[PDB]
């Protein structure tokens, strides 16, 4: 309140009225002793009820503008994370076996369900039981999707390496059974 431009009048009117109490004041000067700090006090309160509103308004943009900054800084951290993805899932397209089906296409459009089926290098087979295993993945090589795949690893549900000799007809009760066979393309 030490810089409000209505402190001078209030201060002076207080001094004139209050400080001059000991001195004999007649009933005519008493009006000046009374109706001089009055009105001035009203105006000061008016000069303080507007300052309090300007302060709050001000401290509602120095908070709503930190939030406009925060979000743009964030908008630049996700815009650079999707970019770092769509350029890492691209360096992975064996562009000899992929430009060989987009080319044999009538216009260059192909179904998406035949891209991993004809242009992939690895196969993952998930097998529930032993009966399913001998009709799908018997031996070290097997044919699927008009191709030939050679087994490379057989992990299990626990993710521990199984060998192709632990898989018997009677040792089967001793394996975590969802078995995951990883195979590579041949030729």
């Amino acid at each position: 309140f030490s810089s409000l431009p209505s402190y001078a009048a209030f201060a002076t009117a207080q001094e004139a009225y209050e400080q001059a109490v000991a001195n004999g004041d007649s009933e005519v000067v008493l009006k000046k002793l009374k109706k001089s700090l009055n009105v001035a006090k009203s105006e000061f309160d008016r000069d303080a009820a507007m300052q309090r509103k300007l302060e709050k308004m001000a401290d509602q943009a120095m908070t709503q503008m930190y939030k406009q900054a925060r979000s743009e800084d964030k908008r630049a951290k996700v815009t650079s994370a999707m970019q770092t993805m769509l350029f890492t899932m691209l360096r992975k397209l064996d562009n000899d076996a992929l430009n060989n089906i987009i080319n044999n296409a009538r216009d260059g459009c192909v179904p998406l369900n035949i891209i991993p089926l004809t242009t992939a290098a690895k196969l993952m087979v998930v097998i529930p039981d032993y009966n399913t295993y001998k009709n799908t993945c018997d031996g070290t090589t097997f044919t699927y999707a008009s191709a030939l795949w050679e087994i490379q690893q057989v992990v299990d549900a626990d993710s521990k390496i199984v060998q192709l000799s632990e898989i018997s007809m009677d040792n089967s009760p001793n394996l975590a059974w969802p078995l995951i066979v990883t195979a590579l393309r041949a030729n």
Binding site: R75, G108, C109, V110, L112, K122, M124, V126, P178
Partner: protein, 103 residues
């Protein structure tokens, strides 16, 4: 109603997004530019550009959400636990999720 009946004659690998190769600043992307519905037939997108330079925010949200790039960079999958058609395996391991008891 007729497409519903006639779509049971055709191979199940012909239904789904139709992808094509586009170029965004000299690099090949695979994106979806249509669809083949068992009911509504073949639908083709109206605003597809083959040669672009810069991707905005509204053009990265439509390329990350599409399954065209996630299922063209993952491994083939043959899942014998289910009888539903299976597309791809996005990683090298299969995730098994359980449910805990109460307190």
């Amino acid at each position: 109603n007729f497409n519903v009946l006639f779509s049971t004659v055709f191979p199940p690998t012909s239904f789904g997004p139709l992808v094509r190769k586009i170029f965004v600043d000299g690099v090949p992307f695979v994106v979806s530019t249509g669809y083949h519905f068992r009911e509504l037939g073949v639908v083709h997108n109206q605003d597809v550009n083959l040669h672009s330079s810069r991707l905005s925010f509204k053009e990265l949200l439509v390329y990350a959400a599409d399954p065209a790039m996630h299922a063209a960079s993952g491994n083939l999958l043959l899942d014998k636990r289910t009888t539903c058609f299976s597309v791809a395996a996005l990683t090298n391991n299969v995730a098994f999720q359980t449910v805990k008891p109460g307190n």
